[PDB]
Amino acid sequence: KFLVEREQMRYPVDVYTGKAKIQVDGELMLTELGLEGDEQAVHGGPDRALCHYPREHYLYWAREFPEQAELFVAPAFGENLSTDGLTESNVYMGDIFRWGEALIQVSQPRSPCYKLNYHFDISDIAQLMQNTGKVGWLYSVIAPGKVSADAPLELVSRVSDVTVQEAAAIAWHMPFDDDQYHRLLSAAGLSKSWTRTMQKRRLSGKIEDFSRRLWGKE
Template identity: 45%
Template sequence: MVEPPPIALDALLIGSLSPIDDRGTLSGIDKHPTLDPVHLGTTGFAGDHQGDLKRHGGPDKAVHHYPRDHYQIWVDEIGSVARLQQPGAFGENISALGLTESDVAIGDRFRLGEALLEVSQGRQPCWKLNRRFDLPDMARRVQQTGRTGWYYRVIETGMVSPDDRMQRVERRHPEWTVARLWHYLYVDTLNREALSAIADLAILPPNWREYAAKRLQTRAVEDWSRRLDGESPASTPDGAVDGRDRSPPNG
């Protein structure tokens, strides 16, 4: 199969820690374009920070890519808010046109400058997007639409420049696009055949495979309320619900 042409970066972004709410919760979601080459290590770009290292960052979330293709759709839906006037609105490290969740699959490898990146997982949006956009349901909107972006792990470290182009060099599981994975995690949530395949997909991080395995065992879906809303969920004792998000998917 002939690979598509290289993709130019719209921006390469890094961020320092800053408070995101009235409690002073620190976050690195406020990222800004860099004009200089940056070293990319196994846990991310030099100078890029995450406030909650338990849920953000680490080898399987070293680099966040969010398609600039989605920005105009968001403008059409929520208005021309200031956040959407420049890349970085969603806390992404890589902004580019021409790659979306339907184009990219788990295990796809991309050469970017000296580095080699591998798609590791889709993004699971959290409540910090609500604060960033000043919309109480922004994280839910991102999850429900499937316009989540995705993460890379770093296979080979090296210098990356804003004018470098991304070239896909390998496809390991082309059948498992980020969009397809999203569909079975958030739409057709109790499809046993798909969940079994996800649980067996060794290239996924362990927690994603555990989601699938637990659903197969319990026939229920984990409650997403705390992650999406930033509040303790009113749920059953094991944190599961009846297979549905409280807000049905619309995408």
């Protein structure tokens, strides 16, 4: 039921951009493709304009790899948005947030990639993120506008009943289930690339391979 829409959920947010990303302190324009100054000019660009990573996960990583605990600080995972209070289990697919003059929508769970394995110098960090579901999520930009580190993320519409955690699990943890794929394809706001993957699974009757993405040349 959608009574969360009326609780005025507000989440203070730290903003990072780059071409390691650097913290932005003032206001900046959020365009269709991303934050002005953030790695700008593989289709589906509009669906991955912004990357979010919960600071809660750094606690977990620092405790899993104490020897390199200094590395586990925002924005080590490449995120643009850093917060507390928002995780894969309470963020739903299609969630629409008002952010200053902008409108953003959750489009998919973030997909761990092997580049991460060389960035943290942890050979299997991409596998680890995917296995724990600690991946964060991306946003599509519904309405471009000025945003800032000062304006909080405000949840305004909840329009699906599939959380990021569920989408992540449906994609990478459970065995082939057509019904589950039909369910994920029904979630509002789904990125075109996730629609494609899930639709390809229904027609092929198989789960595509994850080896190259997670391990690159290995």
